[PDB]
Amino acid sequence: NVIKTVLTYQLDGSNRDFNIPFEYLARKFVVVTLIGVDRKVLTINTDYRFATRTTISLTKAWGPADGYTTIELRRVTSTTDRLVDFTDGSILRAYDLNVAQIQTMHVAEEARDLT
Amino acid sequence: IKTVLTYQLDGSNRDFNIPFEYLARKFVVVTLIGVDRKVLTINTDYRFATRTTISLTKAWGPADGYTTIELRRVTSTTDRLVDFTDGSILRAYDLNVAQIQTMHVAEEARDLT
Amino acid sequence: IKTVLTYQLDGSNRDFNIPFEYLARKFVVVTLIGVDRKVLTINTDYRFATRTTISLTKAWGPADGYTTIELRRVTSTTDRLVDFTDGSILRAYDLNVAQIQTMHVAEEARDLT
Amino acid sequence: NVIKTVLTYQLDGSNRDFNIPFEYLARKFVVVTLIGVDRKVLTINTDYRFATRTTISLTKAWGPADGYTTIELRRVTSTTDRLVDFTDGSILRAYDLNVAQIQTMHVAEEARDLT
Amino acid sequence: ALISQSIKNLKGGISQQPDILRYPDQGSRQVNGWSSETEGLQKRPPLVFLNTLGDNGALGQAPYIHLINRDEHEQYYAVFTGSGIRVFDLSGNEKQVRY
Amino acid sequence: SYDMNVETAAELSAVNDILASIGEPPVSTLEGDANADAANARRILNKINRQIQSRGWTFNIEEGITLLPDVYSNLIVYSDDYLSLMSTSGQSIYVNRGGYVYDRTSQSDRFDSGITVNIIRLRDYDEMPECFRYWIVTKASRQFNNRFFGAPEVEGVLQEEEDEARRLCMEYEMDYGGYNMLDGDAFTSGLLTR
Amino acid sequence: MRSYDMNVETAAELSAVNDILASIGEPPVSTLEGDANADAANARRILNKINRQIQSRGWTFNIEEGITLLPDVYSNLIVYSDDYLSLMSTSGQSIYVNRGGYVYDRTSQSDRFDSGITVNIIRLRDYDEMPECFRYWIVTKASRQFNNRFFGAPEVEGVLQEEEDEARRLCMEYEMDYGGYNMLDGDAFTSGLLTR
Amino acid sequence: MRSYDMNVETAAELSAVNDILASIGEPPVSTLEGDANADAANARRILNKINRQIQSRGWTFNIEEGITLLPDVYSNLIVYSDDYLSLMSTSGQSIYVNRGGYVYDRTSQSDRFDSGITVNIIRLRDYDEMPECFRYWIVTKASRQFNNRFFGAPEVEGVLQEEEDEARRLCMEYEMDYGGYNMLDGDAFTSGLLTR
Amino acid sequence: ENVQVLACQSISSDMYVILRNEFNTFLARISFTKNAIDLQGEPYRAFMDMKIRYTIPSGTYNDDTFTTSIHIPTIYGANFGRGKITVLEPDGKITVFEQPTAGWNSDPWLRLSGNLEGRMVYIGFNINFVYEFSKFLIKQTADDGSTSTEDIGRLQLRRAWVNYENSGTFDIYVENQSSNWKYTMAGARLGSNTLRAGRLNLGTGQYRFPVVGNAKFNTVYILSDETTPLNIIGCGWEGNYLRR
């Protein structure tokens, strides 16, 4: 019943760092947007940055002002692009096989959670 | 063929090749030019993707006037790459690099004239 | 004796005495000065009458504006008369010329300064 | 930029001992001259001695007297004379080889510093 | 346990067997190597040059070569081209054959 | 002629002492074809050199040096050079988070106008006192045989030598520091004034 | 817990693995990515668990005082991920425990939180992003286990145990210098007493 | 550092090398120059290292009090060569450190000096130019290492250990006699108290 | 490479073999005599893979460029393919010339330096004598010809040594799973009596090289090219070997 991939944090004023509980295959998959007026998806280059693997730092201190009441953190896993590709010469490794299994596992998370 | 040469930036170019042969990465010394003679830490500021090509690692820029980069090879005369110690096997390698170092040091001094 | 020297052209003076020692003929380079630097081929443009003296075959005179003839010894740093291999003996003659070849390059630098 | 081979010490009165930082192949290569009136090159026999490999002692007290304000200590390496010569009967050792390159490297030091 | 061992033979030779199953002194491979009796591993003898027989195609593509040893002064090859014969002395000189 | 003042390369000579600690013949050069013992000795020498500096010595700690952020990013870089990073007075606040200086108390990695800290910065094998240079070599020599090729009697002596070497470096720092419990210290000095 | 290869290689981690491999006697490895070396893979596994353990012990820089954990407004329950090595209340008695991966208030018998909580969390860091004094202790401890597990040599084992005790001593010495704890004024109780 | 063969042979050094060689059991060598003996070359390398170390420890004759180091007037920075074993200020707190081979004032963050500085320096000397009492300690320590490195014999190792301990005792005994330190009048603090 | 051996045939003491290059067909003998040198002069019976006692003609040397140039098709029958040619003086001196991209076909001149006006040099190729030692494991020979390896346990081998007699330079490649090492053994050593200048420099000795690893994953193979005999009269290694 719990929605693991999608979760929203109340801004409660100037809170710079937010925790992302879900595991993500790439920093491009995690998408962050403010909520309260419009769904404004933030750019990764300047607007927000991953201070650590599990923590995002937002540059400006939003809060209720800017009519943005809350922040929305979710991951969308790209279907077309595959993180792992297999070639004859390359050595098979645990990293390569785990990514292949878990990527299509991630995509099923969004479908179940959005339902 | 000359050890001393200068590349104009010619836009935000990360990569510049060095024609002169060199022994160690430390020997090659590089300075940004255009406003004042600025020395930079070669290892941290530049990454050698190849031996000849240095990397500004981002678009240093003609902006701000740093539109000139100087390529110099100064092989340290005080620190000898190979010095012979008694009890060590004499080789062709160590004799060759010993000669090419002092010939590099002499060549750099000659070009400085 | 300076490794680099320029001689007054003195009109149609074919031959000129070079006092500095040189390991090889190809190291000695002949240039004409007065309008621009001109490099002359070793065998067609000039001829070595002896080891000590050099004579210009074509007698490029005070004409076209060239007023002086410059004679300097440049020892190539890339080209080495003797090289060391892991096999083989290390004859004393080879070790001496390697010493003096790199000495010649350094001596050229000091004279220019 | 720094001139290693050539360096000058202010006399600051009567000082007997002066330290030579540069390494030298032979004591004849190190040349000492007073500065302030004329370049007076000192004789090694009587005018100045060493008493130490890195220190030279000067007999008389120049100081501000005789118009010699400072002392000049530089090393000039003779190109024509070679410290090490190789013969067929001779055994190669570390001494003979190391002198071969480093004497040449000292000559290039002077040319670079004089520029 | 500071265990060490030394081998004196190396007569051995290349073994394709597993290193466990290999005898001591076998060795994974040797090229241009001569394992000469009591003497140790050696470079093969130097193959000194004698006169060139001819062009690359002078002999057959796949010829039959039979050394002839008649006399201490007369030694020969009877090399058979795909069509025809050529006969050289060991000195390299070619002795013409008439059919 | 023995009037010469030529000195050999210190970094290679330090490696040779590590090799000679067991009796191995000295190596003529470091750069060139890969050599296991030369590569092992050189790595341990830098490993041990980094350790000894990290401990903290009066010459090593740089007092009150300012670290300035990038003007646009407002972030300070906690480079691998910085062996230690502590605040000047006490209860040091700055830590490392993602390679950048992070102020745990204020929970902000963005600073302006710079910060004042006490930094231990890496130095070469040279630029270290002779007391410490011997300690690094004799510490690396003991580490060399323990790890790679073990000689029981060598480790016994090298253990004794390292303790003696450690003691001497402490006497150096104590002599270098010249610490005074009456006037030098922060607390009692104010009390003594009358 | 994550796979060892998942951590990106850095110069610090390359030297740490080389130091661990040297313990049993293996030669140093040039690069960590794209290698078939089984021992190098193990050294990273031993390094990661020792790194995680040494961080688990409360250290001044490691412990974060009074940080705020924000719950999802829709879900109303906080996530207690494996990244949090320790979760303790700021006051004397800690009331937060793990129930199904979510922060659970044992005294309240409720895992649904509103407006967030203030806690002291020890959060895991890489082998880098660690104080240098602690890097040698992590390596020295990891060397002992790596030697013990794979090639147990009594001679090197005794030296490493002595080295670990010295390494632990320096790390405590680091903490006392880092902490700068004051028993008169830094003390919570004594500070109120010194009021005059 | 410097090469072993660089140093000129003297009768003092010839006997020292002979003594180091005898520790293993090698016969004495007649002359040092022009020999192919590998052991003789090592004994000089071990002797020079121990010579530098024993000098590095502060001794009264070794330490030079308040000597003036003069900078190059053009360069303005003093040279901190490897011959300088120790560099300390005459006062309590030493402010001079090495940066790039030049004397660096850490408190001033400047390596450019004018008019010179007064410091305490330990300067390296040959094996000769050394007190006789110290020569046997240098040899005794060197033979201990030379035996250890090349031919490690436990029987001779134990004997050399007590020989070195006695050698150190005599050298300290020499230092106390040489110093002539007075705790009443030679002492800096106590002398000012004794005035009447 | 690209060389086909048409037939090797042996007289009682020596074997005469003919082999074709992609341009030519040659005749050459391999002589199995124990110590005797193959050619007059020839200081130490060089291993040059094609030996000729060449005398350099007077027309070869020129002064405008210092290099004395020799034409390969004249010294041999005609042009060769790919290989490294060594020129060996009447004394020990050796000059090795790297194989050009065209491969001695487009560039058939080999240029020595100095006035080798009429010298008795020896000109020949190189041989790549490779020997791989196989793994270093505990091997006990028992029951008159049966060797059993102690598979149980892990061996951390510390180092190895190779004994050589009257041998010159050679390289001992050590290749672990990750990296590789060379350990070239060239000369007598700097303080040695033997290294005397102008002397033939090859002699008997033991070479000890550090080989470290699992005793099961690192390959130690010796090889040499530099035209000098190599006689290996022993091998060994040292290890720790805790059994588990």
From Swiss-Prot, chains A, D:
Coiled coil ranges: none
Subcellular location: Virion
Keyword Signal: no
The organism's place on the tree of life at top rank: Viruses
Any one annotated GO CC term: virus tail, fiber
Keywords of this entry: Host-virus interaction, Late protein, Viral attachment to host adhesion receptor, Viral attachment to host cell, Viral tail fiber protein, Viral tail protein, Virion, Virus entry into host cell
Chief location category: virion
One of the protein's GO biological processes: adhesion receptor-mediated virion attachment to host cell
Single GO MF descriptor: identical protein binding
Assembly and binders: Homotrimer. Interacts with tail components gp11 and gp12.
Role this protein plays: Structural component of the short non-contractile tail. The tail comprises six fibers made of gp17 trimers, 2 nm in diameter and 32 nm in length. May attach to host lipopolysaccharides (LPS) to mediate primary attachment to the host cell.
Homology family: Belongs to the Teseptimavirus fiber family.
Protein name in UniProt: Tail fiber protein
Taxonomic source organism: Escherichia phage T7
Swiss-Prot record, chains B, C:
Function per UniProt: Structural component of the short non-contractile tail. The tail comprises six fibers made of gp17 trimers, 2 nm in diameter and 32 nm in length. May attach to host lipopolysaccharides (LPS) to mediate primary attachment to the host cell.
Top-rank taxon: Viruses
Keywords recorded for this protein, A-Z: Host-virus interaction, Late protein, Viral attachment to host adhesion receptor, Viral attachment to host cell, Viral tail fiber protein, Viral tail protein, Virion, Virus entry into host cell
Parent-record interval covered: 5 to 117 of 553
Major site of localization recorded for this protein: virion
Listed name of the protein: Tail fiber protein
Biological process, per Gene Ontology: adhesion receptor-mediated virion attachment to host cell; symbiont entry into host cell; virion attachment to host cell
One cellular-component annotation, GO: virus tail, fiber
Family: Belongs to the Teseptimavirus fiber family.
Gene Ontology molecular function: identical protein binding
Assembly notes: Homotrimer. Interacts with tail components gp11 and gp12.
Signal sequence extent: none
Organism, scientific name: Escherichia phage T7
Localization annotation: Virion
UniProtKB/Swiss-Prot annotation, chain E:
Cellular localisation: Virion
Included stretch of the parent chain: 2 to 100 of 794
Quaternary structure and partners: Interacts with head-to-tail connector protein gp8, the tail component gp11, and the fiber protein gp17.
Functional description taken from the UniProt entry: Structural component of the short non-contractile tail. The tail complex is involved in viral genome delivery. Forms the end of the tail, including the canonical tube, the nozzle, and the small extensions below the fibers. Once the tail tubular structure is formed, the interface between gp11 and gp12 generates the proper environment to interact with the six gp17 trimers.
Organism, as annotated: Escherichia phage T7
Source taxon at top rank: Viruses
Ranges that cross the membrane: none
Protein name in the entry: Tail tubular protein gp12
UniProtKB/Swiss-Prot annotation, chain F:
Keyword Cell division appears in the UniProt entry: no
Isomerase keyword on record: no
Keyword annotations: Viral genome ejection through host cell envelope, Viral penetration into host cytoplasm, Viral short tail ejection system, Viral tail protein, Viral tail tube protein, Virion, Virus entry into host cell
One GO cellular component, as annotated: virus tail, tube
Gene Ontology BP annotations: symbiont genome ejection through host cell envelope, short tail mechanism
Source species, domain of life: Viruses
Pfam family, one: Tube
Recorded coiled-coil stretches: none
Signal peptide (residue range): none
Subcellular localization, as worded in the UniProt entry: Virion
Quaternary state and interactors: Interacts with head-to-tail connector protein gp8, the tail component gp12, and the fiber protein gp17.
Protein purpose: Structural component of the short non-contractile tail. The tail complex is involved in viral genome delivery. Forms the 12-fold symmetric toroidal domain immediately below the connector protein gp8. Once the tail tubular structure is formed, the interface between gp11 and gp12 generates the proper environment to interact with the six fibers, each made of gp17 trimers.
Family per similarity comment: Belongs to the tail tubular protein gp11 family.
Name this polypeptide is given: Tail tubular protein gp11
Organism: Escherichia phage T7 (Bacteriophage T7)
